[PDB]
């Protein structure tokens, strides 16, 4: 997260770290057995790590559970990053408590102007690299579809939104992919792509979760 702040241990209780030997992407716990992340975070042999603050120290609140199956969206296009959403089922249900909690799925899409919380263990520098060990948070508004489409001419689909600052300085970055964008308590976005990080006039782009709620409910219901 570039230009954000330290969340505080377990204050974002639905944040997961996806681990295949090291943290490679974030995700959101949406019920005790299912995680939603970005389809570009797909790989085999993912262990889901819940209740993390420092991803390098076992502090006591963690639950490390293997993925039993991954389902990438049926229309994910890695070239356009259109439909960048994937579901991960855990092998066993997690024990939910105040430090491990699921986030609600939206019933409506959120408006431009809505302030959101974005979180992750990704790069904190816009030039060069420094990966944090503890979770970082950022508050950023949803941008209008006009601003988003003029920042990225020809790249924004109806399943994408921009959230951030046109002045730059604050943004998600490498290592934040798959993580939550939560606005008014509902999961509204997934960290997906952008032109670098915290670049002027180049805000982050996010998968628009409200478009996928029937696919998410149907897949959970049958798997
Ligand atoms: B993610 O992979 O973290 C593990 C990361 C989050 C980036 C957040 C940006 N606000 N996502 C990516 O790296 C994705 N790629 C890009 O965002 C690339 C670098 N952007 C890009 O090439 O920009 C253009 C030149 C305009 C197309 C990919 C999906 C891994
Ligand atoms: Ca830890």
UniProtKB/Swiss-Prot annotation:
PTM remark: Subsequent cleavage after Lys-125 leads to alpha-trypsin. Further cleavage after Lys-170 yields pseudotrypsin. A cleavage may also occur after Arg-99. Not sulfated on tyrosine residue(s).
GO cellular component: extracellular space; serine protease inhibitor complex
Binding of Ca(2+), residues: 52, 54, 57, 62
Active site: 40 (charge relay system), 84 (charge relay system), 177 (charge relay system)
Tissue expression remark: Synthesized in the acinar cells of the pancreas.
Keyword Hydrolase: yes
Gene Ontology biological process terms, A to Z: digestion; proteolysis
Domain of life, source organism: Eukaryota
GO MF assignments: endopeptidase activity; metal ion binding; serine-type endopeptidase activity; serpin family protein binding
Pfam families listed in its UniProt record: Trypsin
Catalytic reaction equation(s): Preferential cleavage: Arg-|-Xaa, Lys-|-Xaa
Record keywords: Calcium, Digestion, Disulfide bond, Hydrolase, Metal-binding, Protease, Secreted, Serine protease, Signal, Zymogen
Subcellular localization(s) per the UniProt record: Secreted, Extracellular space
Disulfide bridge positions per record: 7-137, 25-41, 109-210, 116-183, 148-162, 173-197
Cofactor dependence: Ca(2+)
Binding-site list for substrate: 171-172, 174-175, 177
Record comment: activity regulation: Is inhibited by scorpion cyclotide trypsin inhibitor TopI1.
Cofactor binding note of this UniProt entry: Binds 1 Ca(2+) ion per subunit.
Entry EC number(s): 3.4.21.4
Domain Peptidase S1: 1-221
UniProt xrefs under InterPro entries: Peptidase_S1_PA, Peptidase_S1_PA_chymotrypsin, Peptidase_S1A, Serine_Proteases_S1, Trypsin_dom, TRYPSIN_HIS, TRYPSIN_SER
TM regions (residue ranges): none
Family per similarity comment: Belongs to the peptidase S1 family.
Stated name of the protein: Serine protease 1
Organism: Bos taurus
Classification lineage: Eukaryota, Metazoa, Chordata, Craniata, Vertebrata
